[PDB]
């Protein structure tokens, strides 16, 4: 792959690993009853997957152009993953709101 789409790749998995500890900052505050905290949080988590979301739809379009069938279905793969992370993170702010 080219240094571009590897740089790309590098910031996804950087980012997820920032999502991760987010979620799991929220769910341990929503826990000790710190309600503030966990919606801040959870923005914040939206905030960081919707970046992901961009630049793995990046990286798939640099793959796509480049041929590359292997990293295409990796970055198609990834993409899935952020929707579904941003669908249980939109999920658990809306129940938060509610709280």
């Known amino acids: 792959m080219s240094p571009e789409i590897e740089d790309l790749l590098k910031k996804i998995l950087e980012l997820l690993e920032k999502a991760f500890a987010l979620w799991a900052e929220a769910k341990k505050a929503?826990?000790?009853g710190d309600l503030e905290k966990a919606i801040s949080t959870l923005k914040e988590l939206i905030a960081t997957i919707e970046e992901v979301i961009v630049l793995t739809k990046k990286a798939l379009e640099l793959a796509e152009k480049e041929g590359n069938p292997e990293i295409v279905e990796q970055a198609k793969k990834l993409l899935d993953l952020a929707e579904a992370l941003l669908e249980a993170?939109?999920?658990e702010l809306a129940r938060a709101l509610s709280l």
């Open 89 to 91: 993170a939109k999920a």
């Open 30 to 32: 929503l826990a000790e």
